[PDB]
């Protein structure tokens, strides 16, 4: 399952994930590919901010879903 993570700056991060993956896992993946600290990552889906502890399937995040990466300061 691939999801797309988009930033205000116009970057699109294509991640290979599966519903089981938690939001930390996703943030770790984002750091692996882009070197963005999980500390400064804010993931948004369907206008809702995703919480670390929970998984993707908890938010009904499916294939080809687009997430927003808002930068935490």
């Amino acid at each position: 399952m691939q999801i797309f993570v988009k930033t205000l700056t116009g970057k699109t991060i294509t991640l290979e994930v599966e519903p089981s993956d938690t939001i930390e896992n996703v943030k770790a993946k984002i750091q692996d590919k882009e070197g963005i600290p999980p500390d400064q990552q804010r993931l948004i889906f369907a206008g809702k901010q995703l919480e670390d502890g929970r998984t993707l399937s908890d938010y009904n995040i499916q294939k080809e879903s687009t997430l927003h990466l808002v930068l935490r300061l």
Binding site: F4, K6, T7, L8, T9, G10, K11, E34, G35, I36, P37, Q40, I44, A46, G47, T66, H68, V70, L71, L73
Partner: protein, 348 residues
């Protein structure tokens, strides 16, 4: 009927600068008292109490009012027809004195906020902003009246704009500049950036024309760069779902490769995000929306690609710039932030 300018400038006029200082000293640089994102942030050693609606935000809105009037004046001198108010004026008829008064009001437009709480405290924060402005005028009436504000009647008018009781955002040149100046600063956070830019473009364009509007948003990018604030990308081939900004909704492509329209081609039917779709439908994509020729007619976004952030900087590196002590100085030092904006302005 375009008035002569007298060298008035945000970056040299001291009345306008002193309003901003007062606003920062008594309101914008003080901790939020509310609960919604009230906790401050440390940038490179300095505290910033109001990162979303603080000094830099407020100075940028004033900076927008100035370039919008400038670009409007040039538009009308080119012979363009601009949208009129109920008395026949356009933004291009704004005088130096009027713009000064507008900018002073702008400096107080979010001083009344107790946090970033949205909608719920709208009236309270707007009334508190009005009160801040009125206290400022009173304490400085000896220099402000009658040279800046003609009388107490002039004052109330700008007080009323700030309070915004009946949300008449298009009622006068002051209403448009304050409200749309405030609005467009959201280009620094709103996603998807293409949907939001097309929407803001459509709100500003009728007042000053297309050429002026392009120039305003091009200059804004410089204003963001100069104040260590995020510069959005623009990608006409963005495949993510389009966001209908008015109502936060969607458009839908039918089973047949056709947008769903109301009986007429008719308007694209608004779709709530929540509502489910009959199988074989899908949301309209940003790239699809931009190449709709009703959109291309009013917005030159199709075929356009703009790089966000700072070219040559990897995204994480751009973060460090945004998180820098320079951002903090912009949020806490009137002269520095205005200095950053002035350089951006010249760069043209």
């Amino acid at each position: 009927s375009v008035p002569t300018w007298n060298g008035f400038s945000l970056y040299t006029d001291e009345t306008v600068r002193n309003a901003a200082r007062y606003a920062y000293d008594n309101y914008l640089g003080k901790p939020y008292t509310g609960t919604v994102e009230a906790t401050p942030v440390n940038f490179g050693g300095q505290m910033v109490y109001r990162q979303h609606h603080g000094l830099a935000h407020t100075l940028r809105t004033m900076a927008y009012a100035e370039i919008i009037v400038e670009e409007a004046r040039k538009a009308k001198l080119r012979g363009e027809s601009l949208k009129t108010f109920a008395d026949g004026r356009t933004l291009a008829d704004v005088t130096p004195e009027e713009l000064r008064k507008i900018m002073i009001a702008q400096a107080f437009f979010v001083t009344g906020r107790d946090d970033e709480e949205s909608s719920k405290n709208y009236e309270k924060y707007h009334e508190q902003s009005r009160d801040a402005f009125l206290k400022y005028v009173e304490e400085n009436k000896s220099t402000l009246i009658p040279d800046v504000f003609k009388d107490e009647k002039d004052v109330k008018f700008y007080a009323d704009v700030i309070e915004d009781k009946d949300h008449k955002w298009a009622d006068s040149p002051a209403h448009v500049l304050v409200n749309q100046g405030h609005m467009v600063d959201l280009v620094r956070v709103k996603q998807p950036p293409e949907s939001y830019l097309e929407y803001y473009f459509s709100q500003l364009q009728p007042w000053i024309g297309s050429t002026a509007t392009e120039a305003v948003f091009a200059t804004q990018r410089q204003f963001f760069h100069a104040t260590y604030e995020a510069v959005a990308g623009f990608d006409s081939e963005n495949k993510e779902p389009h966001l209908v900004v008015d109502g936060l909704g969607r458009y839908v492509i039918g089973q047949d490769g056709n947008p769903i329209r109301e009986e007429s081609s008719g308007e694209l039917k608004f779709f709530s995000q929540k509502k489910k779709l009959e199988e074989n439908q899908r949301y309209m994509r940003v790239d699809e929306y931009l190449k709709l020729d009703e959109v291309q007619k009013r917005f030159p976004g199709a075929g356009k690609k703009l790089d966000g952030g700072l070219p040559g900087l990897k995204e994480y590196q751009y973060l460090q710039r945004l998180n820098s002590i320079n951002r903090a100085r912009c949020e806490n030092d009137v002269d520095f932030c205005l200095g950053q904006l002035q350089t951006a302005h010249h760069q043209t």
